[PDB]
Design an enzyme around this catalytic site. Structure first.
Site, short mmCIF file in Angstrom:
data_model
loop_
_atom_site.label_atom_id
_atom_site.label_comp_id
_atom_site.label_asym_id
_atom_site.label_seq_id
_atom_site.Cartn_x
_atom_site.Cartn_y
_atom_site.Cartn_z
N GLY A 287 48.00 52.42 52.51
CA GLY A 287 47.06 52.40 51.39
C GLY A 287 46.17 51.17 51.35
O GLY A 287 45.23 51.11 50.57
N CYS B 24 44.14 49.88 53.72
CA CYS B 24 42.88 49.86 54.48
C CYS B 24 41.66 49.67 53.60
O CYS B 24 41.63 50.10 52.44
CB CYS B 24 42.69 51.07 55.36
SG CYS B 24 44.04 51.26 56.53
N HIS C 179 37.40 55.60 59.20
CA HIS C 179 38.53 56.53 59.35
C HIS C 179 38.97 57.25 58.08
O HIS C 179 39.80 58.15 58.15
CB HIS C 179 39.72 55.88 60.04
CG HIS C 179 40.50 54.85 59.26
ND1 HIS C 179 40.55 53.49 59.64
CD2 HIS C 179 41.30 55.01 58.12
CE1 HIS C 179 41.35 52.93 58.76
NE2 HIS C 179 41.81 53.74 57.85
O1 LIG Z 1 47.71 51.66 61.58
C1 LIG Z 1 47.88 52.83 61.96
N1 LIG Z 1 47.53 53.89 61.23
C2 LIG Z 1 46.94 53.78 59.91
C3 LIG Z 1 48.06 53.96 58.85
N2 LIG Z 1 47.46 53.86 57.52
C4 LIG Z 1 47.77 52.88 56.63
O2 LIG Z 1 47.15 52.70 55.58
C5 LIG Z 1 48.94 52.00 56.97
C6 LIG Z 1 50.19 52.56 57.20
C7 LIG Z 1 51.31 51.72 57.46
C8 LIG Z 1 51.16 50.35 57.49
N3 LIG Z 1 49.92 49.82 57.28
C9 LIG Z 1 49.52 48.51 57.27
N4 LIG Z 1 48.21 48.40 57.04
C10 LIG Z 1 47.76 49.71 56.85
C11 LIG Z 1 48.79 50.60 57.01
C12 LIG Z 1 46.39 54.83 57.24
C13 LIG Z 1 45.26 54.70 58.28
C14 LIG Z 1 45.79 54.81 59.71
C15 LIG Z 1 44.62 54.72 60.70
C16 LIG Z 1 43.77 55.83 60.86
C17 LIG Z 1 42.68 55.75 61.74
C18 LIG Z 1 42.43 54.58 62.47
C19 LIG Z 1 43.28 53.47 62.32
C20 LIG Z 1 44.37 53.54 61.43
C21 LIG Z 1 48.48 53.12 63.26
C22 LIG Z 1 48.76 54.30 63.90
C23 LIG Z 1 49.35 53.97 65.17
C24 LIG Z 1 49.40 52.60 65.25
N5 LIG Z 1 48.87 52.11 64.08
#
Ligand code: A1A3N
Ligand code: A1A3N
Lengths: 301, 301
Positions: free
Chosen positions: A143, A145, A41
């Site tokens: 940040g 991931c 992603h």
């Molecule tokens: O997790 C979601 N989106 C993430 C948010 N994100 C982060 O680094 C992050 C943000 C806030 C708390 N966190 C905790 N761990 C990582 C994060 C960037 C990647 C994005 C993403 C893109 C493509 C596929 C999967 C996830 C999401 C959206 C709706 C439900 N969940």
């Protein structure tokens, strides 16, 4: 003596963490030999995220769209590929700090250490477990991931988790290092939610053995139970079924303490039916389920 | 989101751990530049231990009585000295992995990461706090003396604890890296015991702010308290006094959440007087006191 939630020493994994940048999107990657592994992603914009076709998205990228930074050194990408939900970037430099390593896909109930990272830089280390519902209860911000989870076996790092997303309840979902999700989850923004979780019974029993090893013995009793009658109670309290394989795994701890597994099951049955009555076990006022039998053996002896 | 007990990444300290052997006694040491630091009780036999005179014991040792092993490499000792309760062995090789470092003596209530070691080899990492009674509730077996506790400030490792002994209750006692004990303890076998401990109030308040940041809000109320009336309750429940300095330290978290410190004090007062009633905060059924205000800020944001 003493019993703590204990992670593996993180050094060997710290020397593999890199920043991967694709456009305006930046996340962490794992650099082993001449390959960097990260969540696919990274190639997505916000517009794409509703339902991306990743095969199209990657077809439109060149090697020069990927900036890998190791420390202050920029690493040059020379190839790219997708395997399941992970992107693999081939780089021109093999990591000189690569440990001995394996990739392993774990079962629910197994524990691992997480090295939480931001921009390629390690921030903290913690233990967690793969829950029966295939989420983890981690601690992750924007940040993070691409942060990884691991176990160490002597000098071999067994990588088991790469972080991808946070679900609506605040728990976390991700993949093995070959890019396959744990659970039914997908790497898109959709309506997905964690299913109903259960308590990891074999791990609760292990931690009661830890408690005995450390001198908490108040919860013990003179009784025993059959496996079937225990499993009947377990079901009622939303605990996982205990198998004979679990009973056999708890063998060593049973032998050290002198308490038969099904005798310890009668203690747990009593704790489930009655509560602790204001007492604690190992500092806890609830029954802890994120230590495996191996973790107890590791730490106690 | 999520909130875990989180240690610092341990790599920088792993590259400093050595084995020190003196006779039949073996323990861990910390190798920084050309000096190895370890507990002075490495020079003792079992007979000595009732009341050693360490100045006599060290006067009878030569450099060749000390074997230092770093990995598989034996390091040659070229000088020895005692500073308080630590032995300093000068070696012929400066450690090439020495991080930027400081030695700091901490106050009660401060937290730190411990890298537990056996025979020079890191086994696990965990967080703990210096308790008000100057013990730590660690996890340590035979062989772990000389394991260290630390904080990291960017790239600087601030070493704050060296492990020396286990007290009768199963808690742990040790020194700063200049060899001064925390607390009244001495490095001999004697009748010494931990004094009565208290709960670290400012840290409980910090963790309630963490809980709010993460969406647990059930314990909040419309009330407030004066500092004096709060301190009166704190005394009754064996909590440390809250100072204006603590109130000021909790400033940032108060500003982020919108909840005044003395309003959060009224929540804590209510929790102390009534209990949780079967509810949890951040996964806990008791009030947690081993996260500082800085630790919360670090992890949550
Ligand atoms: O997790 C979601 N989106 C993430 C948010 N994100 C982060 O680094 C992050 C943000 C806030 C708390 N966190 C905790 N761990 C990582 C994060 C960037 C990647 C994005 C993403 C893109 C493509 C596929 C999967 C996830 C999401 C959206 C709706 C439900 N969940
Ligand atoms: O802690 C005591 N003795 C230690 C035991 N020991 C260990 O490595 C150790 C053993 C068992 C659990 N542990 C947990 N951490 C370390 C250990 C070797 C050093 C010895 C010692 C010698 C000189 C001065 C101070 C302590 C002691 C004796 C009476 C009350 N306490």
């Amino acid at each position: 003596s003493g019993f703590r939630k204990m992670a593996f020493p993180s050094g060997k994994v710290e020397g593999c963490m890199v920043q991967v940048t694709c456009g305006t999107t930046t996340l962490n990657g794992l650099w082993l030999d001449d390959v960097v592994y990260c969540p696919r992603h990274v190639i997505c914009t916000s517009e794409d995220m509703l339902n991306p076709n990743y095969e199209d998205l990657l077809i439109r990228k060149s090697n020069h769209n990927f900036l890998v930074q190791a420390g202050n050194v920029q690493l040059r990408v020379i190839g790219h590929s997708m395997q399941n939900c992970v992107l693999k970037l081939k780089v021109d430099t093999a990591n000189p700090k690569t440990p001995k390593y394996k990739f392993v896909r774990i079962q629910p109930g197994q524990t691992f250490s997480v090295l939480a990272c931001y921009n390629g830089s390690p921030s903290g280390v913690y233990q967690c477990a793969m829950r029966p519902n295939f989420t983890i209860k981690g601690s992750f911000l924007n940040g993070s991931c691409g942060s990884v989870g691991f176990n160490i076996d002597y000098d071999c790092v067994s990588f088991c988790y790469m972080h991808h997303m946070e679900l609506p309840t605040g728990v976390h979902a991700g993949t093995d290092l070959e890019g396959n999700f744990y659970g039914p989850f997908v790497d898109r923004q959709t309506a997905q939610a964690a299913g109903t979780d259960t308590t990891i019974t074999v791990n609760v029993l292990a931690w009661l053995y830890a408690a005995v090893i450390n001198g908490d013995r108040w919860f013990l009793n003179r009784f025993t139970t059959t496996l079937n009658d225990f499993n009947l109670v377990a079901m009622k309290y939303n605990y996982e079924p205990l198998t004979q394989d679990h009973v056999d795994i708890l063998g060593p701890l049973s032998a050290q303490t002198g308490i038969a597994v099904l005798d310890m099951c009668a203690s747990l049955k009593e704790l489930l039916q009655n509560g602790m009555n204001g007492r604690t076990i190992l500092g806890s006022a609830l029954l802890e389920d994120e230590f495996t039998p191996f973790d107890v053996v590791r730490q106690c002896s």
